[PDB]
Amino acid sequence: VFSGDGKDFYRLSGNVLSYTFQVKINNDFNYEFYNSTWSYVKHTSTEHT
Amino acid sequence: ISTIQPKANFDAQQFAGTWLLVAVGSACRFLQEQGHRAEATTLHVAPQGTAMAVSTFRKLDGICWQVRQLYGDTGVLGRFLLQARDARGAVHVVVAETDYQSFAVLYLERAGQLSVKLYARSLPVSDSVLSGFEQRVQEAHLTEDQIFYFPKYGFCEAADQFHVLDEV
Numbered sequence: 186v187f188s189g190d191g192k193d194f195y196r197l198s199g200n201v202l203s204y205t206f207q208v209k210i211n212n213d214f215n216y217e218f219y220n221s222t223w224s225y226v227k228h229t230s231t232e233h234t
Numbered sequence: 235i236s237t238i239q240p241k242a243n244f245d246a247q248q249f250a251g252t253w254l255l256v257a258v259g260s261a262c263r264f265l266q267e268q269g270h271r272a273e274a275t276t277l278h279v280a281p282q283g284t285a286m287a288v289s290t291f292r293k294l295d296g297i298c299w300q301v302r303q304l305y306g307d308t309g310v311l312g313r314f315l316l317q318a319r320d321a322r323g324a325v326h327v328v329v330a331e332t333d334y335q336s337f338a339v340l341y342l343e344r345a346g347q348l349s350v351k352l353y354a355r356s357l358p359v360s361d362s363v364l365s366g367f368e369q370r371v372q373e374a375h376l377t378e379d380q381i382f383y384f385p386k387y388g389f390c391e392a393a394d395q396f397h398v399l400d401e402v
Contacts, residue, residue: 191270191271192270192271193270
């Protein structure tokens with residue numbers, strides 16, 4: 186067989202029913218992101234004369 | 235076996251700098267059986283005498299490399315011996331057809347076998363130059379199928395220290 190990948194000829198045994206040289210590449214990506222931020226202020230005063 | 239004439243009044247002070255490899259004419263079984271996954275390749279040249287001072291730049295498996303060499307001259311202008319730096323011994327080396335503006339053709343020989351190389355000084359090459367090089371391949375007594383054509387892209391220069399061979 187001539188492999189269309191790695192670009193070479195190869196020999197096969199009578200033990201293998203089929204050696205194919207198809208290519209498939211299947212990719213799945215998941216990227217998930219969070220960010221959060223807070224700020225707070227309180228003040229009081231109580232006064233006399 | 236017979237020897238071609240070198241470039242008459244050649245000058246390494248004027249033939250200098252980069253030369254991008256287009257192709258190589260050789261009978262060698264390595265390029266017939268191993269030759270797949272070939273590498274982007276270029277010559278680089280400077281004056282030091284009648285002898286050329288030289289580097290080859292090349293990628294190896296995606297890492298860039300440099301082959302430093304001195305083309306020690308035969309006593310004939312444009313003919314050199316490759317300084318026999320390893321147990322393979324000498325290589326006879328020649329510059330045979332060129333214009334320093336656009337193209338160079340070199341002959342290289344060892345163990346009675348001729349081989350030839352085509353370079354252009356920039357990315358493109360003229361079909362007239364390529365046709366002339368095939369006549370130099372046929373003058374090396376090789377077929378156009380013994381021409382192997384190298385990567386027309388991804389060339390390298392200025393590799394790091396541990397990727398220069400220091401062969402001299």
